[PDB]
């Protein structure tokens, strides 16, 4: 009920000539678009990637980004020139733009910039501004970008109008990939611990969607408090993976079960006995 839309741009600048920009677009944790540097056009990665935009609107949109990609390149190269020898190559720039939806006719948009892996600049209201912690030299770049009235107008439109309007289309066009259920499959394994007399039990859980999941080692009705659940890891077919580990005495593996809970099972848990 609370989906975030993220346009993520990655730009690398090796030196005064070499550069690349690739971006990917997400809606929650599903990928909607890809745009490799090596491609003239934006690639859809879902049948519903266009949401409820018409061709003329998409063509037009894709056109302005094409122009942006080239423009953005020359711009950074030129800011470097303005700031050097203060700041110099290699340079990494990342952008995260998009908006978040709320179950009213409600939304908030963001557009954040990182420089060398650090969040430094955002667009806010009608201008770019620096965030707390940013280095003061960025003021010149900002003063400059802010001088460009046409760009600010364009960026306001994108964040205030276009993006929400776009996404609400996507959310309707895309339900049932979004609301899809994929059942987890679980299996058990065991490894020696760095302790000189112990055993680490691992409960692998893979293939489930959406993300929310509950995995716990049980001895009957008893939840084993020492369960360490791992990070959520992606699969290539857009499902998730996760495991949970428990440290055990050698010879206390007796009668333990890993228990899995997920929306997809319809409330018949997976219980796997050792």
């Amino acid at each position: 009920k609370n989906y975030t839309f993220r346009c993520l741009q990655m730009s690398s600048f090796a030196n005064r000539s070499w550069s690349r920009t690739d971006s990917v677009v997400w809606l929650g944790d599903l990928q909607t678009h890809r745009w490799s540097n090596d491609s003239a056009t934006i690639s859809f990665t879902k049948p519903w990637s266009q949401g409820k935009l018409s061709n003329q609107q998409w063509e037009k949109l894709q056109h302005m980004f094409q122009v942006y990609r080239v423009s953005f390149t020359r711009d950074i190269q030129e800011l470097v020139k303005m700031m050097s020898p203060k700041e110099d190559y290699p340079i990494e720039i990342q952008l995260s733009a998009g908006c978040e939806m709320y179950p009213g006719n409600a939304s908030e948009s963001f557009l954040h910039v990182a420089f060398q892996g650090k969040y430094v600049v955002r667009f806010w209201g009608t201008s770019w501004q620096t965030v707390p912690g940013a280095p003061s030299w960025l003021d010149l770049p900002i003063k400059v970008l802010n001088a460009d009235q046409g760009t600010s107008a364009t960026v306001q439109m994108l964040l205030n109008d276009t993006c929400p309007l776009f996404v609400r289309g996507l959310l309707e066009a895309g339900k049932s990939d979004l609301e899809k259920q994929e059942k987890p499959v679980a299996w058990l394994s065991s490894v020696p611990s760095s302790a000189h007399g112990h055993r680490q039990l691992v409960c692998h859980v893979s293939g489930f969607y959406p993300k929310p999941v509950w995995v716990m080692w049980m001895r009957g009705d008893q939840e084993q408090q020492g369960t360490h659940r791992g990070d959520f890891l992606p699969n290539a077919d857009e499902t998730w993976y996760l495991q949970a580990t428990l440290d055990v005495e050698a010879g206390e593996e007796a009668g333990l079960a890993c228990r899995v809970k997920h929306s997809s099972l319809g409330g018949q848990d997976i219980i796997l006995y050792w």
Partner: T-cell receptor, first 111, second 113 residues
């Protein structure tokens, strides 16, 4: 809000060193050197984003640039050739898109 | 280059109207500026056009911009002798100093007194 150039008019010999100066008191960061030849728009040679900075433009060969200060931007011809006979415009500007142009410098190089 | 002007030159009698065309392929096209240069002298800015379909006036000079057509015109009402000059179309590709100026080769105008 204006820019001066010196000299207005220069007669050099092939293989001479020539310095065309440009001076502005607008406190602009950015100065630009162009040349004008009949049948052509102005073409950028070198430019600058501040004292200490010089940057190649479209046709930099045969020229070096110098920005010793906020105020001053020079174009230097270490070895003049007849092909550098031209009228030379300097300009300056702040963060905005407007560039303010000097009155120009008519230069002639001779054998 | 990326900015074409037309005509290359023209001769008009004092008091007559004339119109000057400019056509370009500069991308992006933030703004377009028209300059008057007298023989010998430097560049005097006449007017700058910024909008998608802009129109500007300044004394006896008026101008239009169509960014779709990437086309501008400069009208002069009731020419005077001092209009004898070269008129230059300039397209700028940013709304800031990060931009480069794209110069037309100009249009020479002679006014017969």
């Amino acid at each position: 809000a204006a820019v001066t150039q010196s000299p207005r008019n220069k007669v050099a010999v092939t293989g001479g060193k020539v310095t065309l100066s440009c001076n502005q008191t607008n406190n602009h960061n950015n100065m630009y050197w162009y040349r004008q030849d009949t049948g052509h728009g102005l073409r950028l040679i070198h430019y600058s984003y501040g004292a200490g900075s010089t940057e190649k433009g479209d046709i930099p060969d045969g020229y070096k640039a110098s920005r010793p200060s906020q105020e001053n931007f020079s174009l230097i011809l270490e070895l003049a050739t007849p092909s550098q006979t031209s009228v030379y415009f300097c300009a300056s500007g702040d963060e905005g898109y407007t560039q303010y142009f000097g009155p120009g410098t008519r230069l002639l190089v001779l054998e | 280059t990326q900015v074409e002007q037309s005509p290359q030159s023209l001769v008009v009698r004092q008091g007559e109207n004339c119109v000057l065309q400019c056509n370009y392929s500069v991308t992006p096209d933030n703004h377009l500026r028209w300059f008057k240069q007298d023989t010998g002298k430097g560049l005097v800015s006449l007017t700058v056009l910024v909008d998608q379909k802009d129109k500007t006036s300044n004394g006896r000079y008026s101008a239009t911009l169509d960014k779709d057509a990437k086309h501008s015109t400069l009208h002069i009402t009731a020419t005077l002798l001092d209009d004898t000059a070269t008129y230059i179309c300039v397209v700028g590709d940013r709304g800031s100093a990060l931009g480069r100026l794209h110069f037309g080769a100009g249009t020479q105008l002679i006014v017969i007194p």
